[PDB]
Every structure is written in C-alpha cells, then in structure tokens.
C-alpha cells in the first residue's frame, strides 16, 4: 500500500504553489503500453473509382468515399470495434446491405457521432480527434461506460464480485466510492452532471458578500451541491489520472484567468461534449440495443470522461489517426 520513488512531477502553476502532476513512472508506463495497442493506420488507398453511394445499396454516411477507401474504413472499423468478431459482427454473411444485426444500425449512429465529435467538438478533441478505437479499445462494448447507477468494476472487461453487482444493495456505497476516487461522497456525479445538462456544476458565489434574495432559506442551493460538485471533480481527476492542480489553483477554484490552466477550459468543453454525446447519441440508442445491454432503468450505456481518457489526461497519450481517416472528421 505504498508506491516506491522516484515520482515524476510536472509544474502547472507559479513556482511555489505546489501545482502540477504527480505521476508514478510504472503506472504511466503501464498505461502508455496499454494505449500503444492502438492499431496503426491502414495504408492509404488510391481514390480511383466512383462514389460508393452509386456502388453499394445501403450506404447512408460514407457515400462520398470511393469503394477502396470505403472498404479501408470498414476494415479499420472492424479492427477498432470487433477485431475478434470480424465483419460478420455487423453484417449478414450473405447481405452486406442488410441491417438485420443491431450492431449495423448502432455502427451507423456511431459513425455520425464520431464525425460529429471530430467536427463540432474540436474545441475539446482538437486536431487529435477520436476514432472508434478511443472508446471501444478493441471490443464492441467499450470497457468504460456508465449506466444511471454506479457499476463495478469500472472496466466492464473484468468480472464483478457478488457485492459489486448492482443487484447487491449492500454494495452501493462501494460502487459509488470507486466512481469518485474512493471518497465517501454520497453523490453520483455522472447522472447528476454528465447524463444531461439539467444541473449547474458551479457552486461558489462570485461575490464577496451574500447577495440578498438568493442567500436565505429555500432561495439558496443546498450544501449538497457543493458535495456533488466535489464528487464530479474527484471522478474527473481520476478519469484523467490527475489531480485538481492540473486545472485549478486551489487558492480559488471558481476563478479563471491566471487561476486556471488551459486544460480546465478544455475540460469545460469536455463536459459539454459528453452531455451532447450522451443526450443525443448514446442515450437514444437504448431503442436499438438488445435489452441485454440496457441497465435496470432501460438506459443504454453512456459515456463520461473515462470512456475516452481511461486514466490519461490525453486519450491514448495524444495518439491520432485523424489525418489517416478523414471520413471520421472533421467534416467540411
């Protein structure tokens, strides 16, 4: 229960403020390797030939690609989402234009969703962007997802113990704790702040004195919001494998400017993008997904910071395939 030195440390604030990352080399190496599994881009192909919109029958998203380019996309998709399953995971051996299998439908929504991410959320994913791999990391079901209830293990590739199962009520507190960096924070930040945009993350007053008319009785927000916020922050820190000072100068959390690091702004955009994704792409999918995938509330697995980041401040240590697969965005 103790990691041996030395520790890698970065600086992210003015000298003397103790702001920065504290990384355990080994742990970083363990993750650098895991992410290095990112399949390399497939050799570029000649754009020769007409658009697949003419060639194939049921192509509603990659119709502008040429046949060769299109198949290259399909290979990449397979390699990122279902390498073990192969093409048949979404197709009918005898009818590639068939939509019989649900993964086909969802994959289409996912193609759009990805294109969206790389196009409408560049303020977050920047020029790195994302591909099916970023989330799926090689399996139809992304290792890190969320239901309207905390679930254990965080990585669904692992098998839960009895208490970890959402069925075991006596395991609720621990399920939650592990979603908030092991804190006893009695709040589920994901549903509260990431499932949709109904709640406000900020809770600190922007004035020195209490403004009359919002500072008494039922006018004021309950302290619980401060906890909820704290929780969301704990999980965000954990999801990126980093600490508060990576974005804040604890001297004044609520303050921006010199009190915040660029990353915080990015994080800000991350929250919006995650909400967009969940609300408009993932959440609805509960209609196309077999009841087998749904949660106890019939919800579809949704994304959060960890879904892509998986313990790293930059998904896959900033690896990118954007230039290699322009079909995934940005779309001009």
């Amino acid at each position: 229960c103790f990691e041996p030195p030395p520790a890698t440390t970065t600086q992210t604030g003015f000298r003397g403020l103790s702001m920065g990352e504290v990384l355990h080399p080994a742990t970083v190496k363990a993750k650098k390797e895991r992410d290095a599994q990112y399949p390399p881009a497939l050799a570029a192909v000649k754009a020769e030939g007409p658009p697949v919109s003419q060639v194939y029958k049921n192509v509603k998203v990659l119709g502008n690609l040429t046949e060769a380019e299109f198949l290259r996309t399909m290979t990449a998709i397979t390699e990122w989402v279902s390498p073990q399953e192969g093409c048949t995971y979404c197709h009918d051996e005898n009818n590639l234009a068939s939509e019989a299998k649900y993964p086909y439908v969802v994959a289409r929504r996912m193609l759009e969703m990805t294109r969206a991410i790389n196009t409408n959320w560049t303020q977050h994913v920047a020029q790195t962007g994302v591909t099916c791999y970023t989330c799926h990391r090689g399996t139809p079901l992304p290792p890190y997802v969320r239901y309207l209830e905390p679930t254990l293990p965080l990585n669904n590739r692992e098998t839960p113990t009895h208490v970890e199962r959402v069925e075991t009520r006596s395991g609720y507190v621990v399920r939650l704790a592990k979603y908030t960096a092991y804190s006893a924070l009695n709040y589920d930040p994901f549903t509260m702040f990431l499932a949709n945009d109904k709640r406000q993350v900020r809770v600190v007053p922007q004035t020195a004195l209490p403004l009359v008319g919002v500072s008494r009785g039922k006018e004021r927000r309950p302290l619980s919001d401060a906890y909820a916020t704290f929780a969301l922050m704990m999980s965000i820190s954990d999801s990126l494998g980093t600490n508060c000072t990576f974005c804040h100068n604890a001297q004044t959390f609520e303050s921006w400017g010199k009190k915040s690091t660029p990353q915080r702004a990015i994080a800000w955009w991350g929250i919006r993008m995650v909400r967009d994704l969940n609300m408009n792409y993932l959440a609805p999918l509960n209609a196309s997904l077999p009841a087998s995938r749904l949660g106890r509330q019939g919800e579809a697995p949704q994304a959060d910071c960890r879904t892509c980041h998986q313990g790293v401040t930059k998904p896959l240590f900033g690896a990118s395939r954007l230039k290699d697969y322009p079909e995934l965005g940005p779309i001009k």
Partner: protein, 323 residues
C-alpha cells in the same frame, strides 16, 4: 538524565484516597484497581467513577444519538454485517440533501440526522452540567466548564446555528468518519476557501499555539521535575526554585516570562480561543460573507501570482458558448 520524566522507576501503592464532594459521594460506583504498566507513565489507579444524574442523562442521550446513527449506517449497507464493518468509514447519516430551508426534513432525508443531532446536543449539555457540577461539588473553580462550553458552542455552530442563520439544514455536518470530513471540503468550497477566512486563521493560530504552549509548558515542567515543578498548586501559593528556574529559562530565552499560575491562564486562554475564534468564523460565514477569498480580494488581502501556463478565459463567458 532525570528518568523520572520518562516513566516512574519505582511505583508506589497506598490506601485509595477520596475527597468528599458537597454531594454525590454515594454516587461514586466502582472498585479502584491498579495497573502496573499504566502506572509507569501515569497514575496506576483506575476508577472509581462518579455517576450522578447528569452523567446518566448524558449516556442516555448520547446512546440514543449513536443508535440512530448506526442504524442508519447499517441501513446503508442493507444490514449486511460484513459490508457494514468493511464500509464503516464511508458510512454516515447525512443532513437533508434537498432544500427544505428550515422546514423539518423527511426522516429519510435529514429527519434522522436532525434527531441524532438533537440527542447528541442534549448529551453534550448533560455532560457539561457534569463537568460543571463536579467542579462546584469538589469546591473548585468552573474554569474547565467554560473552556468546554466554548467547544460545545462551536459544535452547535457548525451543527445548527449556522444552518439556522442561513436557514438551511443541508448545511449541517453529517455523522460519519469520512462523511463528516467530506463536509469540511464541501463547506470550504462553498464559502470560497476557508484559508481566507480570518477566523479560520485565528483558530489555527491558537491551535498551533496550543501545540507550542503544551510542548513548551510540558517540557518546562519535566525540565524542573527534579525540583517539584509538577506540584504546580503549591508552586503558585509558594514560589519555589522550580518555577523560579522555569521562569528564568524563558525570560533569558525570549526576553519575558510568566508565572507558574499565569502560564496555565495563557494555555487556558489559547485553548478557549481556538473554539471561540472558529465559532465567530462560522457565525460570520454564509451570514455576512459568501466567499472568503473574494472577501479578501475586496479588502486587498489575497496574494496574486503570475500565470505559469497561459491565463485562461472562462469558456462560459466567451461569445457563442454552450450553457
């Protein structure tokens, strides 16, 4: 090297002494037994112990309080004995999560917490009577009771006075190892960093000071134990070379000194000030200050630093940004 200061080389035993109180003497239950090891670094005699109505009322209420809490914790782990023991630190009894203002909250959302707090309070009150009475009964000054009163007062402050002032129970401190601790951050975060609350600083000053005073007072006495320094009472009524040297040690060191009696007043005061200070800090928080940091900036106190990484504009204030 006065080893007597480290532990008692030769322990002693003798008839169990007893001082009669103005009352309650017949209420001292228990048979004084001795502990050899205890006696090595303290007084070997354990017990008896005064009961009285206050003491009993105290246990009565305290227990009721503790029971309400555990049952709720137990209920959290669905009464699974193994998880209860496993997840103990993470379990707690929370104040209302929703906003009901000062309205009494539902049992499942603040109601139980409120009751536990009521019984804990009564329990504290009874024990205060105990700490007070015993003093009068034994014909002693009520100094301890007052210092203890400050402590009970502070608890009341973070417990219900503050919540009352701003008008919301949700502000209360939850019962639980980790939980009552998580409150410290949620509370500080809400009021814009407690490090910028002058009273927080004052309180810390006295706490740290109590550390400095006991380390110093304690080391002082041991350093003059060879002369009887430990027999402080008669050192007061009749100054002896012990306290003379204790005094000269400090005067020659820091330029001024105290008396064997005054140093206790200093220490008493400091102790008291830790609680008094924090009570004020809490009474002021939420009531007349909403963000201690901005409050410091306003009064030109808060320090500022150059940016290291580029200053970052609040994304939410940029033109055409999502909500």
């Amino acid at each position: 090297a006065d080893y007597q200061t480290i532990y008692t080389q030769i322990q002693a035993r003798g008839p169990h002494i007893t001082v009669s109180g103005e009352w309650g003497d017949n209420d001292r239950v228990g048979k004084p037994f001795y502990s050899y090891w205890l006696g090595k670094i303290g007084d070997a005699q354990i017990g008896p112990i005064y009961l009285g109505a206050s003491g009993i009322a105290a246990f009565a209420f305290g227990s009721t309080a503790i029971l309400i809490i555990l049952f709720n914790m137990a209920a959290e782990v669905h009464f699974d004995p193994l998880q209860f023991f496993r997840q103990f630190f993470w379990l707690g009894l929370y104040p209302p999560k929703a906003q009901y203002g000062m309205g009494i909250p539902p049992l499942h959302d603040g109601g139980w917490w409120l009751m536990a707090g009521l019984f804990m309070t009564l329990s504290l009150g009874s024990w205060w009577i105990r700490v007070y009475s015993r003093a009068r009964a034994l014909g002693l000054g009520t100094h301890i009771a007052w210092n203890f009163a400050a402590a009970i007062f502070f608890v009341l402050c973070i417990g219900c006075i503050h919540p009352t002032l701003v008008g919301s129970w949700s502000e209360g401190v939850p019962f639980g190892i980790w939980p009552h601790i998580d409150w410290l951050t949620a509370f500080s975060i809400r009021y814009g960093n407690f490090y910028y609350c002058p009273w927080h600083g004052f309180s810390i000053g006295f706490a740290y000071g109590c550390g400095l005073l006991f380390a110093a007072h304690g080391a002082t006495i041991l350093a003059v134990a060879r002369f009887g320094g430990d027999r402080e009472i008669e050192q007061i009524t009749d100054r002896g070379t012990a306290v003379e040297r204790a005094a000269l040690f400090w005067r020659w060191t820091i330029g001024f000194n105290a008396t064997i009696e005054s140093v206790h007043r200093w220490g008493w005061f400091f102790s008291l000030m830790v609680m008094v200070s924090a009570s004020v800090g809490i009474l002021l928080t939420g009531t007349f200050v909403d963000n201690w940091y901005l409050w410091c900036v306003k009064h030109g106190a808060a320090p500022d630093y150059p940016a290291y990484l580029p200053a970052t504009p609040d994304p939410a204030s940029l033109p055409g940004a999502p909500k």
